[PDB]
RNA sequence: UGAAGACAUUGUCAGGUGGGGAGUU
């Protein structure tokens, strides 16, 4: 386990800036004085407390499996991909928000992209390819993805048209059981 | 269309300097950005790049002064760390 | 109820650490905010 | 053309008062500033929202009234219809004024000069300035149903 | 000489980890 370098943290924070607003809130000292840091273990980024990460040093490298909340993995080509295990962090400070109905939440959890007839609420003034976080009508976070068109463009859409490409949904927890 | 990383292209000295070039196929020594001040200065450029064009001249200046102040505070911490390393 | 008052004197300990030279008066308020924090803490479990 | 020349002389007097920090005059300046900012150029709207930020930081260095005056003026700028439709284009974020209003509520309860005996900014007492600030934050005329509940709580 | 105070800090052993630093193949 090692912390990120200059190149790795630029890539990680670039992916987080696509989906969130208050990125300085994440790197901010709390009441006790400790901070939240980033750790890398086996090509995987963990968003964990510094006090937790300091007392996890005594675990051997091969013998350590997880730490706090896993954001995602860095691939072989160097890109950083976000996972659904980062969704509570994304939902806390989501920039653009889309709400789906009960007839659209179940297709999303199976792995489908959001269709126009599934949407129950939009966020005004959303650009074309922006990072949105998907909720249901009960304000339960379901996943995140990228919008297909702008909000003004998607209001005129035929209701079988795609309004948000799916990237992660919380049915991935059923995959690893 | 192919990537410059795969081709063995030498680095060229421009107005942007080349700096000290690490040899190919050897240890590119990792420098860590665990420090919060070093985390803030990287965060300032990420937020500035995503925001883009601002019509206001004053708000465009404040977007740059935030990056400048982040660089100054990080440099003061690194100089104090260098002084502590020189003492040790 | 108490919370606006302790945070008021916490600023006051900051200015005297930076006014008068009343170390005896300064020490008496230190015990006073140590009291108010403790009874605030000790009531949160009930 | 005449409106351009009058707006230059009117706004120059406004900004020279804000620089000189005349207390009784700058209450009236913010009323004129909130009334007439939508006539002036689009680029200067974000400058006014940033000059108000610099004033609030200067009082943070009586002083409760100046900060609440500039806070209600910023909310009165985005109150207007044309400025509200330009939140996305003109990057006008009121997050500074919301957060500075939140951090000053404990200190405002302690200070005892909160009640001293048809405009919007130039009100006399600090309490009704606080009331009009919270009315803007918690009960906005636009998007009153799309308010973050965590900010409400 | 004023202030804090038997709590920190510090020191010695025995350990854990060490993708960072220095040496050998």
TrEMBL record, chain A:
Belongs to the NIP7 family. This is 60S ribosome subunit biogenesis protein NIP7. Keywords: Nucleus, Ribosome biogenesis, RNA-binding. GO terms for biological process: assembly of large subunit precursor of preribosome. Required for proper 27S pre-rRNA processing and 60S ribosome subunit assembly. GO terms for molecular function: RNA binding. InterPro entries: NIP7_N, Nip7_N_euk, PUA, PUA-like_sf, PUA_sf, Ribosomal_synth_fac_NIP7, UPF0113_PUA.
Automatic annotation (TrEMBL), chain B:
Residues 74-88 have a biased composition (Basic and acidic residues). One of its GO terms (biological process) is ribosomal large subunit biogenesis. GO terms for cellular component: nucleolus; preribosome, large subunit precursor. GO terms for molecular function: mRNA binding. Keywords: Coiled coil, mRNA transport, Nucleus, Ribosome biogenesis, Transport. Its main location: nucleus. It comes from the Eukaryota. Coiled coil: none annotated. It is found in: Nucleus, Nucleolus. Belongs to the LOC1 family. Component of the 66S pre-ribosomal particle. Required for efficient assembly and nuclear export of the 60S ribosomal subunit. This is 60S ribosomal subunit-like protein. It comes from Chaetomium thermophilum (strain DSM 1495 / CBS 144.50 / IMI 039719) (Thermochaetoides thermophila).
TrEMBL record, chain C:
It is found in: Nucleus. Belongs to the NOC2 family. This is Putative NOC2 family protein. It comes from Chaetomium thermophilum (strain DSM 1495 / CBS 144.50 / IMI 039719).
Automatic annotation (TrEMBL), chain D:
Required for synthesis of 60S ribosomal subunits and the transport of pre-ribosomes from the nucleoplasm to the cytoplasm. It is found in: Nucleus, Nucleolus. Belongs to the CBF/MAK21 family. The chain holds residues 395 to 590 of 688 of the full protein. This is Nucleolar complex-associated protein 3. It comes from Chaetomium thermophilum (strain DSM 1495 / CBS 144.50 / IMI 039719). It comes from the Eukaryota.
């Amino acid at each position: 386990m090692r912390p990120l370098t200059d190149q790795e943290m630029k890539i990680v924070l670039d992916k987080l800036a696509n989906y969130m607003t208050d990125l300085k809130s994440l790197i901010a000292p709390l009441e006790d004085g400790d901070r939240y840091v980033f750790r890398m273990q086996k090509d995987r980024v963990y968003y964990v407390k510094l006090s937790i990460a300091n007392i996890a040093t005594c675990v051997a490298r091969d013998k350590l499996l997880s730490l706090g909340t896993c954001l995602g993995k860095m691939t072989k080509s160097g890109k950083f991909r976000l996972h659904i295990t980062a969704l509570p962090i994304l939902a806390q400070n989501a920039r653009y928000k889309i709400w789906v109905k009960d007839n659209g939440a179940q297709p999303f959890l199976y792995g489908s992209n959001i269709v126009k007839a599934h949407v129950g609420r939009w966020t005004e003034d959303c650009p074309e390819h922006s990072g949105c976080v998907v909720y249901n009508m009960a304000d339960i976070p379901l996943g995140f993805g990228v919008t297909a068109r702008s909000t003004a463009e998607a209001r005129r859409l035929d209701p079988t048209g795609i309004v948000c490409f799916r990237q992660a949904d919380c049915g991935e927890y059923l995959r690893d059981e | 269309v192919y990537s410059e990383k795969e081709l063995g292209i030498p680095q060229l000295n421009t107005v942007t300097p080349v700096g000290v070039t690490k040899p190919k196929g050897k240890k590119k020594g990792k420098v860590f950005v665990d420090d919060r001040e070093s985390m803030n200065t990287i965060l300032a450029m990420v937020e500035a790049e995503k925001q883009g064009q601002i019509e206001s001249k004053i708000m465009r200046a404040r977007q740059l002064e935030e990056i400048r102040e982040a660089r100054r505070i990080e440099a003061e911490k690194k100089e104090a760390e260098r002084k502590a390393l020189l003492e040790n | 109820f108490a919370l606006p008052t302790i945070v008021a004197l916490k600023r006051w300990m900051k200015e005297m650490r930076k006014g008068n030279k009343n170390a005896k008066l300064g020490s008496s308020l230190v015990v006073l905010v140590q009291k108010l924090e403790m009874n605030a803490k000790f009531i949160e479990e009930r | 053309r005449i409106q351009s020349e009058i707006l230059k002389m009117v706004f120059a007097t406004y900004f020279r008062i804000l620089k000189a920090r005349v207390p009784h005059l700058m209450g009236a300046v913010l009323e004129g500033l909130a009334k007439y900012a939508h006539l002036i150029n689009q680029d200067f709207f974000g400058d006014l929202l940033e000059a108000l930020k610099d004033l609030i930081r200067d009082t943070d260095r009586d002083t409760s009234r100046e900060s609440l005056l500039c806070t209600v003026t910023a909310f009165a700028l985005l109150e207007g219809q044309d400025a509200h439709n330009a939140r996305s284009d003109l990057h006008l974020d009121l997050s500074f004024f919301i957060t500075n209003l939140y951090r000053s509520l404990l200190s405002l309860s302690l200070n005892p000069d909160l009640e001293l005996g048809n405009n919007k900014i130039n009100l006399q007492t600090t309490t009704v300035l606080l009331l009009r600030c919270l009315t803007s934050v918690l009960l906005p005329p636009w998007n009153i149903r799309s308010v973050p509940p965590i900010r409400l709580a």
